[PDB]
């Protein structure tokens, strides 16, 4: 189980919710994240090092936002066959962590695009409209990592993907 | 474990093998397909009714090439989290069924290509060139049934990709 300070860095931003990584770094869901505002946390656009590729997005701030937490492993990805944690806050501020094995990093047809992400099986009550921007995380020996960010789920909700750093590796036809 | 008729119905075709379904019934992976044939197991093209969907080809005989077979279940897909076993025979002879959890139906970026067609992880020795067509299978009660062909894997081998009959089931933004 996450404890507290964990669910803390778990953060309501825009129609969804971001994660604080460290006391500078926070990511999210790319279409989560507000438009036509010139402020995130009280701070200048300008002032942020935005990074996004397709539905991972990354701030680094210029200033300590959360000085309260140390710095966490960000994954590339998260290892396929793992059991991994989705840290779920709701609007009722509901905890509902749910559990899920990692498949592969792939592209999902969504709503006529084709999303680079990485989908799971919901092993555990799922994933609803709102949640984009949840954290997948897994431990490693003591320590908590994450590894992608929750971005879609299908009809049945049985299947979830979330938006990763990692890109396309090497795949050979046999 | 597989059946010796299990195994029987592994085939060797092309530049690589495919799985009798039923007595009129074959199934293979596109790319292994030869090219510049009149005939396929003797029987012309043109009494062949071929179905092709990306990386996922069946051919129905109209005369029956393999009596001694029982119809099994052709699923359009393999059961997401389900561990099935590939089907792999080598060109020495020898049998090598691999354990393969299987995950999510997705498009996955191989050699250019965006490939249609579902991914495992591998449990188990793993895929080589020259094991496409080999069928992805699992037991239902006390019968096999087949959900996919094997078309492709990761640099690493770890991540295997098997052609499958299902579309793009629907996923939605949350």
Same mark, same amino acid.
């Given at each position: ?5 964990? =669910? ?8 969804? =919710? ?17 438009? #036509?505002?010139?402020?995130? &946390? #009280? %701070? ?10 397709? +539905? ?9 936002? *959360? ?7 960000? %994954?590339?990805?998260?290892? +396929?066959? /793992? ?10 501020? +509901? ?5 899920? *094995?990692? #498949? ?19 092993? /555990?009550?799922? /994933? ?5 921007? $949840? ?15 929750? $971005? ?6 049985? /299947?979830?993907?979330? $938006? ?8 050979? &036809? %046999?």
């Amino acid at each position: 189980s996450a404890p507290p300070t964990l =669910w803390s860095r778990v953060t309501k931003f825009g129609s969804g =919710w971001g994660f604080w990584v460290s006391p500078t770094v926070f990511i999210t869901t790319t279409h989560v994240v507000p438009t #036509g505002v010139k402020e995130f &946390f #009280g %701070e200048p656009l300008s002032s942020i090092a935005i990074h996004q590729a397709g +539905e991972f997005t990354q701030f680094r701030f210029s200033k300590k936002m *959360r000085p309260d937490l140390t710095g966490m492993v960000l %994954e590339e990805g998260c290892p +396929e066959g /793992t059991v991994c944690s989705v840290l779920i806050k709701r609007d009722s501020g +509901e905890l509902l962590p749910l559990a899920v *094995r990692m #498949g592969a990093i792939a592209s999902m047809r969504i709503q006529g695009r084709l999303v680079h992400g990485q989908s799971g099986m919901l092993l /555990t009550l799922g /994933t609803i409209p709102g949640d984009c921007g $949840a954290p997948y995380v897994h431990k490693r020996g003591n320590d908590w990592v994450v590894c992608g960010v929750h $971005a879609a789920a299908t009809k049945s909700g049985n /299947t979830v993907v979330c $938006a990763v750093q990692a890109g396309e590796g090497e795949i050979n &036809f %046999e």
